[PDB]
Amino acid sequence: RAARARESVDNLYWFMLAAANSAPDTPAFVTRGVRTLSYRELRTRVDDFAAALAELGLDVDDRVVLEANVTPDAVAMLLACSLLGLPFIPVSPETPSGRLRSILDTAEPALFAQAEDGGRADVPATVGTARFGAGGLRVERAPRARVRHRREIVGTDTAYIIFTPKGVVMSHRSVVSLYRAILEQGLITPEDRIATTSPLQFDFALFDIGLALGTGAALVPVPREELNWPRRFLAFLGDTGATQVHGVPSIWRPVLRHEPELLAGLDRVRGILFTGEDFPLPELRHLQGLLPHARIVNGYGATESMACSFTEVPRPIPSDLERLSIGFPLPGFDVSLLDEHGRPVEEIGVAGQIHLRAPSMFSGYWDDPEATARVLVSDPLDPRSGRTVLRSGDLAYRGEDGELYFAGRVDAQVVERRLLEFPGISAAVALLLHAFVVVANIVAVDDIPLTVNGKVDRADLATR
Amino acid sequence: RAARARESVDNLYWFMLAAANSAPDTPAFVTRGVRTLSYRELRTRVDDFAAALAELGLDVDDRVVLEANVTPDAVAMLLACSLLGLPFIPVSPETPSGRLRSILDTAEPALFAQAEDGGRADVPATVGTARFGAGGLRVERAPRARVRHRREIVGTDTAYIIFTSGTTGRPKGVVMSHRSVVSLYRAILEQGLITPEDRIATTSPLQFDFALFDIGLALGTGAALVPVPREELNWPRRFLAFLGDTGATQVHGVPSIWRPVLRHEPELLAGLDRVRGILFTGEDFPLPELRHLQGLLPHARIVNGYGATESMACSFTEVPRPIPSDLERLSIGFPLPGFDVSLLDEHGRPVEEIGVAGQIHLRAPSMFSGYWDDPEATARVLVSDPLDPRSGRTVLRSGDLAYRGEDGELYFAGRVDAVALLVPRDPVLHAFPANIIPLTVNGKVDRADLATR
Ligand SMILES: Nc1ncnc2c1ncn2[C@@H]1O[C@H](COS(=O)(=O)NC(=O)C[C@H](N)c2cccc(Br)c2)[C@@H](O)[C@H]1O
Ligand SMILES: Nc1ncnc2c1ncn2[C@@H]1O[C@H](COS(=O)(=O)NC(=O)C[C@H](N)c2cccc(Br)c2)[C@@H](O)[C@H]1O
Ligand SMILES: [Ca+2]
Ligand SMILES: [Ca+2]
């Protein structure tokens, strides 16, 4: 009686668990005492969680809030939700009760699921509650009864919604389409062990989980506690055998400050990937210098396409490089640089708004058709087809070879990188005009404050 | 300097020519003296046409009107247009000059291409003109010079635009992405309807996506396409001789292709012991005519194909063998795996009651991008899913009514907005019931033509 996505249909369950068919006994997870979990045991876990979820009688398109960080149990849950066409809303357990309530009021999910050891209480009675562990999914309060209307699950069904409220809706066809494009460009192999640092509510964790499991590689989730302490973090990457380290630039700040020598001892790290914001070039030159046998990739993209471009940094980085390239869109992705009037910008070095044609496009903003119509727009180069493109809110310019350079947001123009030129300045935040700098008004500080997702907390700086 | 779609990107060129890599010397076409064309020779033809097209400096999304029927040359052209991200507008050569001008005014194509022997003259000077043959693509009048802005071709780029007249007299251009078409080709290749050993008799004009279905299904599989010329079709003897001499194993056509053959040559039709399959779509197959065709070819599986241009297709259901004599109407069955139908009432609420008619709302991976230059029409048809109105997920509001049986099978129950005609003012009920068949170019009942009596 529960709809299950068929093998022939774009769905996270089939995409991420292909390796259970082809290599059941290869490790899918490495966690902490270093233990592996097989693709086979991972799949059995997804299936058990799916059986328990199926019994609740949720229709396809019914929403499950998933409060957890990147764990084998949290990934088995989102894959079980995926199989049953139940869109997952990932929420980090470090989210204030206030912001979870706001998500629960807009999303109106049928079910809220957290870990057995998780400590969320005071979820309202309108929403069902459950708890997951390797033992199984245990229901505290059953969702209200309903009639199931959807017969079959399809590729355009919603896989996940990312809330910041702003809810980016993403189809299984869209996510899998990005996973395929980056598997094509050959960024990692089944032999790799991917250190992922992002919280689960940030699609960079969904990228890392999908990239890894889709390839047949092992995921190495780094808990936030291990991450906070430079020596704890490096010992974690060491003990788990990480070959690839994925994170926002900020994961490196403490280790470059307090433990440069020890970071130079990650003899097994073949790669580093970052996205989310500019990597300060001084910090980036230092990390490259200490790990010379590690490929470093600049990943550019937004939640509404999951991602867009992946560009290897020059090795070494030119010491008077003004800006890093965000390179070329993935095969099957295409960027126009349009001026204020939607006209192409064919002049090298002139900034225009990135308009993205992608096979990984979001379905829309949850319950916000007016916002959707401002962002997901008629292709200005083919306005009559009804083709839509992402109006990105990102400015960029091209070099002589057609490479892109991120030039900040349209909405932020009303200094950072000309302070990075000054000796001893390793990271600089300017906002509206104060400036805050890591060594009108200018305040030197120790570290920059971070959002939960690990970006420059500009709002927090604004208030001091 | 021209953009070419990459191998990894949903595109008709790579989808339809994969067999040139894996089986270059298997036949892709059988035509009439019975001659084959290999996947290898087909590809060489597409590649030559692509080199010639590339020289015209067309940008990705620039439109090429293709006036032709299903020929090896016409298919090589649409695959070369495909590779270069140039959307093809297929037009039947028996289209009045008046209707071609209407398409040319809306579509504002950069190029109009026809066969060497084709006889369209005085195409306007605003549009480039060319002619194709085995010899090559020859440009009479070159398209305007322009600046190429598109760097890369993507799966969501427009493969083809199908132009008919809407329910008003306004041009109706169904825009279809490469990702959308290839997605349907894959779903029907999955269901295993034909094999590389099959020879597909295709009857549709090129301007009807049933020809695009047949071309794609066949070439995508590695099978052989058997295009039936329109003249040979109209004369029943010539038609059956053609199916016989070409070794056709599958016959694709609207029901009307059978009317003449069942009238004048039933016993000759019974001679095609090589036909394993028949496929039809476009309208109801009259049961008497269908029982007659079944009777004459008892070793032929017959499939009921249901769908519209805006998803290319939807469902494929075997007609029962034999047809139980007490059948009210044929089942249009179950949507293809990865396709899904809701039956909604007038208020967008689900219809869970067996035998009650609702409007088909279709969730499909083969959805059209929109109606050419008609965003208001697009918003009436490509609508917010009434079962998930907040996601921004969209469904096809089909304009078809249907109902379900005991087992959840579908039955077509006609149009929401609606041979027995209802000519309006109470609508008077004529038939050809108060008082008591001409064909559209695509081979359907010309209801409009009967209405004028
Ligand atoms: N590489 C850069 N240099 C500079 N500015 C960047 C870069 N990457 C982004 N950004 C900025 O961050 C915005 C986007 O924010 S987001 O929607 O929260 N998503 C993200 O941050 C992460 C994004 N989904 C993602 C996830 C996985 C892999 C990749 Br590859 C990308 C972009 O619009 C840019 O303004
Ligand atoms: N099998 C039926 N029983 C009864 N009524 C049918 C059937 N198939 C359609 N129709 C009608 O024709 C309409 C649609 O018209 S259309 O856009 O010109 N497309 C078509 O005719 C053909 C359609 N693209 C197609 C092409 C190839 C294969 C298949 Br499988 C389907 C549908 O809305 C239906 O009303
Ligand atoms: Ca254009
Ligand atoms: Ca629903």
> CATH number for the domain including B194?
3.40.50.12780
Assess if residue B2 is contained within a domain.
no
For tokens 């009021």, the residue is A105
Point out the ligand 1 atom lying closest to the alpha carbon of residue A207. 27
Domain termination residue (choose one: B128, B154, B177): B177
Residues A346 and A428 in one domain: no
Residues B118 and B218 in one domain: no
Assess if residue A199 is contained within a domain.
no
Please state, as a whole number, how many other Cβ atoms lie within 10 Å of the Cβ of residue A142. 14
Assess if residue B383 is contained within a domain.
no
A173 contacts B365? CB cut-off 8 A: yes
Pocket around ligand 1 at a 6 A CB cut-off: A 203-204, 207, 275-278, 298-303, 306-307, 326, 394, 406, 409
Question: How, if at all, do strands A364-365 and A167-171 pair?
Answer: antiparallel
Distance from CA of B390 to the nearest CA of A (A): 4
Assess if residue B1 is contained within a domain.
no
Q: CB-based contacts of A213: which residues, under 8 Å, 6+ apart?
A: A16, A17, A19, A28, A39, A42, A75, A219
Q: Which residues of A are documented as binding site for Ca(2+)?
A: 61, 381
Domain termination residue (choose one: B158, B177, B196): B177
Assess if residue B7 is contained within a domain.
no
A357 contacts B154? CB cut-off 8 A: yes
Elucidation method: X-ray
Q: Which residues of B touch A329 (CB under 8 A)?
A: 152
Residues A423 and A408 in one domain: no
Q: How far apart are alpha carbons B307 and B360 in whole angstroms?
A: 11
Distance from CA of A98 to the nearest CA of B (A): 23
CATH number at residue A149: 3.40.50.980
Q: How far apart are alpha carbons B395 and B387 in whole angstroms?
A: 10
B155 contacts A184? CB cut-off 8 A: no
Residues B59 and B144 in one domain: yes
Resolution (A): 2.6
Residues A408 and A421 in one domain: no
For tokens 């003990």, the residue is A239
Please state, as a whole number, how many other Cβ atoms lie within 10 Å of the Cβ of residue A313. 22
Q: How far apart are alpha carbons B183 and B181 in whole angstroms?
A: 5
Q: What are phi and psi of A404, to 5 degrees?
A: -100, 150
Contact B403, B358 (CB under 8 A): yes
Q: How far apart are alpha carbons A104 and A127 in whole angstroms?
A: 8
Helices (runs of H) and strands (runs of E) counted in chain B: 13, 23
Domain termination residue (choose one: B177, B192, B225): B177
**Residue of A300, A354, A361 with the most ligand 1 atoms within 8 Å of its CB, for mutation:** A300
Q: CB-based contacts of B395: which residues, under 8 Å, 6+ apart?
A: B342, B361, B362, B363, B382, B383, B385, B386
Q: What are phi and psi of B245, to 5 degrees?
A: -70, -25
- DSSP code of residue B444: S
Of B292, B267, B265, B264, nearest in space to B278 by CA: B292
Q: Which two tokens stand for residue A2?
A: 């529960």
Q: How far apart are alpha carbons B265 and B63 in whole angstroms?
A: 43
Please state, as a whole number, how many other Cβ atoms lie within 10 Å of the Cβ of residue A461. 18
For tokens 């809701």, the residue is B342
Q: How far apart are alpha carbons A409 and B166 in whole angstroms?
A: 43
Residues B142 and B267 in one domain: no
Residues A155 and A234 in one domain: no
Sign of the CA dihedral running A188, A193, A196, A202: positive
Point out the ligand 2 atom lying closest to the alpha carbon of residue B307. 31
Of A51, A84, A319, A306, nearest in space to A202 by CA: A306
Q: What are phi and psi of A115, to 5 degrees?
A: -65, 155
B6 contacts A151? CB cut-off 8 A: no
For A171, the enclosing helix (H) or strand (E) is: strand A167-171
Q: Going by CA atoms, what residue is nearest to atom 20 of ligand 2?
A: B282
Residues A325 and A288 in one domain: yes
Residues β-bridged to residue B404 = B410
A102: containing domain:
12-170
Strands (E), A46-119: 64-67, 88-91, 111-115
Assess if residue B143 is contained within a domain.
yes
Ligand found nearest the CA of B388: 4
Strands (E), A247-361: 271-274, 295-300, 309-312, 334-338, 352-357
A152 contacts B335? CB cut-off 8 A: yes
Provide the CA B375 distance to its chain's centre, in angstroms. 23
Contact B130, B150 (CB under 8 A): no
Residues A387 and A442 in one domain: no
- Cα angle: A446, vertex A452, A458; to 5 degrees: 55
**3-state SS class at A241:** coil
Contact B203, B258 (CB under 8 A): no
Residues A59 and A84 in one domain: yes
Q: Which residues of A are documented as binding site?
A: 61, 275-276, 278, 298-299, 303, 381, 394
Pocket around ligand 2 at a 6 A CB cut-off: B 209-210, 213, 281-284, 304-309, 312-313, 332, 400, 412
Of A199, A203, A204, A196, nearest in space to A237 by CA: A196
Contact B154, A381 (CB under 8 A): no
The Å distance, Cα B412 to ligand 4 centre, comes to: 25
Residues A54 and A95 in one domain: yes
Nearest CA in chain A to B161: A385
For B164, the enclosing helix (H) or strand (E) is: strand B158-165
Q: Which two tokens stand for residue A272?
A: 């580093």
Residues B226 and B323 in one domain: yes
Distance from CA of B243 to the nearest CA of A (A): 34
DSSP annotation string for A193-222: EEEE-S-TTSHHHHHHHHHHHHHT-EEEE-
Cis peptide before B322 (omega within 30 of 0): yes
Nearest CA in chain B to A389: B156
Q: Is B190 buried (19+), middle (13-18) or exposed (0-12) by CB count in 10 A?
A: middle
Contact A366, A161 (CB under 8 A): yes
Q: Give the count of domains, chain A.
A: 3
Identity at A116, one-letter amino acid code: E
Q: Which two tokens stand for residue B331?
A: 């089942």
Assess if residue B100 is contained within a domain.
yes
Assess if residue A21 is contained within a domain.
yes
For testing contact with chain A, the best of B147, B354, B385, B393 (most A CBs within 10 A): B393
